Amino acid sequence: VCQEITVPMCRGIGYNLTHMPNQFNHDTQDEAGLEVHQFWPLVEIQCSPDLRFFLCSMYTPICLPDYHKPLPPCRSVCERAKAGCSPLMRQYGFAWPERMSCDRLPVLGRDAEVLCMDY
Amino acid sequence: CQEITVPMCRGIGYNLTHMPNQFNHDTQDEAGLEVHQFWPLVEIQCSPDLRFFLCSMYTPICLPDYHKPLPPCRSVCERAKAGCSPLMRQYGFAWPERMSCDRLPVLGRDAEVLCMDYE
Ligand SMILES: *[C@@H]1O[C@H](CO[C@@H]2O[C@@H](C)[C@@H](O)[C@@H](O)[C@@H]2O)[C@@H](O[C@@H]2O[C@@H](C)[C@@H](O)[C@@H](O)[C@@H]2O)[C@H](O)[C@H]1NC(C)=O
Ligand SMILES: CCCCCCCCO[C@@H]1O[C@H](CO)[C@@H](O)[C@H](O)[C@H]1O
């Protein structure tokens, strides 16, 4: 079922409803929120206008009542967030996370059936 | 003029402030005790501009020889508020009238009245 997003950083990014489990097999929004919370300093410095949406699109993925196929962000969204923010993370000892590697995401419009979120 | 010591407002783009502020806080410790109550909102990151906007009022910028207060531009407040007011209202906290945006100058509306913007 669809549930109103309760992860504070992921409200006001363009959609209201999510569903668990997410990509990472978090079972609740609480669990997902406790993890995405750690990215707040990266969102604050604005190394990429895409980062917050990209993160939320994975941690609290959009839920549409009638749609049951996954709606990941598009690869291009990941790539822009990574290009923007990776150097800064790298500068603080953090690598771009394994679970966020962009090549796991669909390319926009490559397959008619495979939809994805652009920003 | 004096070095900024409230932890939230260090490293925000300017280093010096002047007491009293527009809240008639006589010390940075008094000012910081109030602005730190907003700290959870900074970590929530409903707006990247929030911290700068709050600090620009609680630990206002002090400029050598200027001897006059310099407020944030209205647009700075409007971005902070557009991002964070919805979450504050949901959590039962009214956007305080003291940080109303129409109390602040619009950049360039009167060339003689200065304000700080940011990105
Ligand atoms: C996205 O959500 C907003 C806010 O909805 C309210 O808060 C969420 C957490 C739930 O608790 C909802 O039941 C609440 O309505 C929607 O905006 C509101 O819509 C009406 C009721 C109006 O009173 C307005 O002032 C509210 O802000 C918004 O429509 C929704 N977007 C959609 C559905 O596309
Ligand atoms: C846990 C989520 C926190 C939501 C943000 C609340 C920020 C606190 O904002 C509150 O505003 C009021 C203005 O008079 C006063 O009670 C306090 O100055 C201040 O704590």
Domains assigned to chain B? 1-119 (1.10.2000.10)
Question: How distant is the alpha carbon of residue B39 from its chain centre?
Answer: 13
Closest C-alpha to ligand 2, atom 13? B96
Beta carbons of B73 and B107 less than 8 angstroms apart: yes
At residue A33, φ and ψ (nearest 5 deg) are: -65, -40
Beta strands in chain B (DSSP E): 2-3, 16-17
Question: Of B59, B73, B49, which is closest to residue B14 (Cα–Cα)?
Answer: B59
* B110 Cβ neighbours under 8 A, 6+ residues apart: none
Given an 8 Å threshold on Cβ–Cβ distance, is B44 in contact with A8? yes
CA distance B55 to B51: 6
Closest C-alpha among B94, B17, B26, B23 to residue B60:
B17
Pairing of strands A3-4, B2-3: unpaired
Residue with tokens 């049951």: A68
CA A111 to chain centre: 21
**Counting runs of H as helices and runs of E as strands, what totals does chain A give?**
4, 2
Token pair for A38:
């750690």
State the DSSP H helix or E strand holding residue A4, giving kind and residue range, or none if neither. strand A3-4
A7 to chain B: nearest residue by CA?
B44
Resolution (A): 2.2
- With beta carbons less than 8 A apart as the criterion, state whether A13 and A51 touch: no
Picking from A70, A80, A118, the residue whose alpha carbon sits closest to that of residue A100 is A80
- DSSP code per residue over A71-93: -PBPHHHHHHHHHHHHHHHHHTT
Query: Does the distance separating the beta carbons of A11 and B87 come in below 8 Å?
Result: yes
- Written as one letter, the residue type at B28 is Q
